């Protein structure tokens, strides 16, 4: 990947503060991207994926909301070394953004969500990643679909940034890295996918909001 300092300070930071969405294409290069693809396909082939879940579960099936199957990756697992390198490269960019992404203080993140929409028209209805203050402030997604033709296979991530005259269509392009504010400024949907679609997400936490959310959880 490119030098983290310049990419963070001269592109990611201004793009995020002005637009709340930032696309970095050709993030890791073809070789590393293909190694990540092989690791993800191996997770898929060995039965690691389970139905994607929601923050709050009511009467409805999760599959009426999101049709993907996922697994959580810490980064040090055998067979996930290149996913780990991806996560460390994401983290390096974020660390070089310290104190420049809005008013957030980013001290931590989730594990990586490796997610697959297995074609068949699966998608994710319009939603907000963090609508009620669970600590998530930045969503970071890496796409790894070599040969994706969105005009036939669908799977576009459509974001509706608040206050803007146009929505943002993000094709799940090979080696594309995406950042966006996780809060209600960026409702978004994964449009139906007609081929197997892979992406890896980490969510970065704002320290004070995440502390408040942990307190709420630990007190009931």
């Amino acid at each position: 990947p490119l030098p983290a300092l310049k990419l963070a300070l001269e592109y990611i930071v201004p793009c995020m503060n002005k637009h709340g969405i930032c696309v970095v294409d050709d993030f890791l290069g073809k070789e590393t991207g293909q190694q990540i693809g092989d690791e993800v396909r191996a997770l898929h082939d060995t039965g690691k994926f389970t139905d994607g879940q929601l923050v709050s579960q009511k009467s409805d099936s999760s599959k009426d909301i999101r049709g993907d199957k996922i697994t959580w990756i810490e980064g040090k697992e055998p067979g996930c070394e290149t996913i780990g390198l991806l996560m460390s490269s994401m983290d390096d960019l974020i660390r070089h953004c310290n104190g420049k992404l809005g008013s957030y203080k980013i001290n931590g993140r989730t594990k990586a969500m490796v997610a697959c929409y297995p074609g068949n028209g699966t998608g994710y209805v319009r939603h907000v990643d963090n609508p009620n203050g669970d600590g998530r402030c930045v969503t970071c997604i890496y796409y790894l679909n070599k040969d994706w033709d969105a005009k036939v296979s669908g799977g576009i991530l459509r974001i509706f940034p608040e206050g803007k005259a146009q929505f943002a269509d993000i094709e799940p392009k090979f080696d594309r890295l995406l950042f966006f504010w996780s809060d209600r400024r960026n409702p978004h949907e994964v449009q139906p996918a007609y081929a197997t679609r892979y992406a890896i997400t980490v969510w970065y936490f704002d320290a004070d909001e995440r502390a408040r959310a942990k307190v709420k959880y630990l007190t009931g």
Partner: peptide
């Protein structure tokens, strides 16, 4: 209005979280 947490992608609230 709808409780948007019913559409939001789950994350663990327990355990640590990874520290940067």
């Amino acid at each position: 209005e709808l409780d948007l947490e019913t559409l939001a992608p789950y994350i663990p609230m327990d355990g640590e979280d990874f520290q940067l």
